[PDB]
């Protein structure tokens with residue numbers, strides 16, 4: 223009857239404030255074609271799987287046009303709007319204000335980031351071999367900076 | 378090295394030269410060309426060492442979920 | 453004291469892999485039994501008799517047939533599968549109603565099969581607890597890397613299931629049908645072309661060595677009854693097993709260069725069948741046979757191993773399949789899966805396949821560090837799935853996920869349990 227069977231200590235659950243049909247009035251203002259069903263499906267997926275974006279998009283089944291950054295942006299804006307609507311009467315600070323701050327994200331930057339990373343990963347073997355050789359030679363010249371500087375000073 | 382290159386001094390020398398002086402001049406020339414190529418690669422946005430900063434989810438980094446404890450026991 | 457230790461529940465771990473099923477206990481390290489994925493059947497008498505123990509099948513019997521169960525990693529002939537499971541439980545002397553059962557199964561599986569399996573395990577065998585973890589996740593559990601790209605190379609199906617943070621990606625699975633069965637059929641048709649006739653072990657009663665390619669003397673013990681074709685095929689499967697174990701060897705696409713030299717060195721080996729015909733195999737044939745996994749250059753249709761595409765214009769082969777699996781992954785986690793490649797499968801024991809796979813992957817995917825992880829111990833390669841099942845059952849926190857019989861009844865519909873509790 224040692225109710226604290228151990229391992230219950232870790233029954234920690236990630237907390238995400240939820241929305242109902244009534245609160246969608248605050249969310250009414252915000253090829254997207256978002257609606258109540260898609261939003262609630264997204265929130266159920268994010269509550270079940272502990273916010274792992276690739277697994278959430280893979281287990282997503284409402285419709286396939288939804289892309290990673292679209293889901294991320296919609297989730298972040300919904301969360302920040304709800305939280306602000308929830309700190310309206312009593313101003314929010316500390317940790318919660320700090321999350322609100324970070325969530326001033328931007329979807330365009332990342333697609334630019336992802337496109338940039340894909341472009342770099344798609345480079346030809348010769349170019350990346352040249353880049354590696356440049357880095358190696360730069361470090362080789364790096365390792366002997368002191369002697370070169372002293373010799374230049376003497377000369 | 379580029380605040381005052383040695384290749385300007387060497388033709389204007391008034392003292393006996395040595396192989397070592399030319400060694401140093403060639404080495405600083407290699408420094409200059411390597412940095413120029415590095416800058417040219419960086420300008421074309423084809424430099425792997427320079428990447429945009431990635432977004433971080435505020436929720437994940439705060440608290441440990443059950444799955445992460447299970448993965449600790451895993452490892 | 454800090455609870456670093458995991459808690460063990462004595463829970464049986466069951467597997468249903470394509471070629472062999474490996475039962476075992478919870479906290480141990482090796483499976484107790486590993487029966488082949490076949491069940492015998494004899495109908496000579498008016499009644500029906502089943503033979504499931506591995507040793508008892510191999511002996512000849514008057515009216516005896518052998519029927520496959522594990523077709524492509526999905527349970528088939530469930531009526532015989534449940535009988536095999538019950539016999540396997542009885543041999544292990546398992547005590548029901550006090551031991552949880554963890555059941556491993558492939559990435560792709562029919563929903564009806566899962567419902568039937570869970571219903572039988574919870575309402576017929578009266579097991580208190582159950583669970584259905586997916587096989588690639590379980591293998592990742594075995595090798596201890598929770599973020600990896602499992603690349604299976606089994607007998608029937610080659611499966612590449614990306615895993616992020618310890619859970620599989622269902623839509624990212626790439627299933628190619630070019631596997632050990634492809635090698636078996638290709639080498640069978642090579643033996644057919646050479647005219648070699650493989651005889652079963654039981655037929656041989658007195659034989660003498662003869663290295664000549666011509667027919668060799670082998671006294672035959674002929675029984676009164678007639679032997680079924682499936683029995684002979686199953687017996688020949690063993691001989692192909694040792695012959696694949698011994699002869700095969702793969703080289704990095706340099707076969708055409710040393711094609712002429714290999715006859716000059718005369719590096720051919722002999723494989724002695726139970727008949728005694730020590731057939732010579734030139735190194736070119738062995739090298740091409742091994743490389744056929746990586747490029748199906750054989751145009752003879754493969755004897756019912758036809759052209760196949762992902763989730764089944766040209767068959768891709770293993771290296772290009774891995775490249776395609778890597779490409780579809782998002783760039784956010786692509787290096788993480790690239791740097792952690794877990795290559796399971798008993799067919800990996802063929803020398804040189806992993807080395808040239810690494811070479812091809814690093815050449816065709818420049819700038820992305822691809823390090824391939826395998827296992828030195830044979831038992832780890834052979835039964836990684838059961839290792840993962842055992843370690844998961846031994847985990848402490850995992851115990852909040854067991855599916856109960858009362859929970860199953862209260863939920864009722866298997867759809868809700870399968871989606872959430874798996």
Ligand SMILES: Nc1ncnc2c1ncn2[C@@H]1O[C@H](COP(=O)(O)OP(=O)(O)OP(=O)(O)O)[C@@H](O)[C@H]1O
Nearest residue numbers: 469470471472606607608632693697797798799801
């Ligand atoms: N050393 C070996 N090298 C290559 N093949 C082998 C070796 N030993 C056995 N084999 C054969 O290769 C095949 C490998 O089957 P394996 O046991 O890996 O499959 P499994 O457990 O059914 O799982 P899966 O097919 O789903 O990966 C079998 O047909 C086996 O007889």
Ligand SMILES: [Mg+2]
Nearest residue numbers: 469470471606
């Ligand atoms: Mg199998």
